[PDB]
């Protein structure tokens, strides 16, 4: 989960 | 802001982070 | 909706602005  | 992967409950938290007091929608493809 | 971008691949927080009123 979270960022690219 | 950054390019963010958002799993479906953690989106509703991240939207919270964006909207403030504006009010917002979680409309998925059921 | 935008959930079928987000729950599977990246989004912008500016699309999350679109999903405000």
Taking an 8 Å cut-off on Cβ atoms, the answer to whether B2 and A4 are in contact is: yes
- Asked whether B28 and C8 are in contact (CB, 8 A), the reply is no
Chain A residue numbers with beta carbons less than 8 Å from the beta carbon of B4 are: 2-4
- Asked whether B9 and C6 are in contact (CB, 8 A), the reply is no
Count up the domains in chain B and report the number: 1
B7 interfacial to chain A (CB closer than 8 Å): yes
Per-residue 3-state assignment (H helix, E strand, C coil) for chain B: CCCECCCHHHHHHHHHHHHCCCCECCCCCC
- Asked whether C16 and B12 are in contact (CB, 8 A), the reply is no
- Asked whether C1 and C18 are in contact (CB, 8 A), the reply is no
- B29/B10 Cα distance (integer angstroms): 17
How were these coordinates obtained?
Answer: NMR
Which domain, by its residues, includes B24?
1-30
* Spatial CB neighbours of B29, under 8 Å, sequence gap ≥ 6: C1, C3, C4
- Angle value at C-alpha C8, between B15 and B7, nearest 5 degrees: 40
- Asked whether B20 and C13 are in contact (CB, 8 A), the reply is no
């Amino acid at each position: 989960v979270y960022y690219r | 802001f950054v390019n963010q992967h958002l799993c479906g409950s953690h989106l509703v938290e991240a939207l919270y982070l964006v909207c403030g007091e504006r009010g917002f929608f979680y409309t998925p493809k059921a | 909706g935008i959930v079928e971008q987000c729950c599977a691949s990246v989004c912008s927080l500016y699309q999350l602005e679109n999903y405000c009123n």
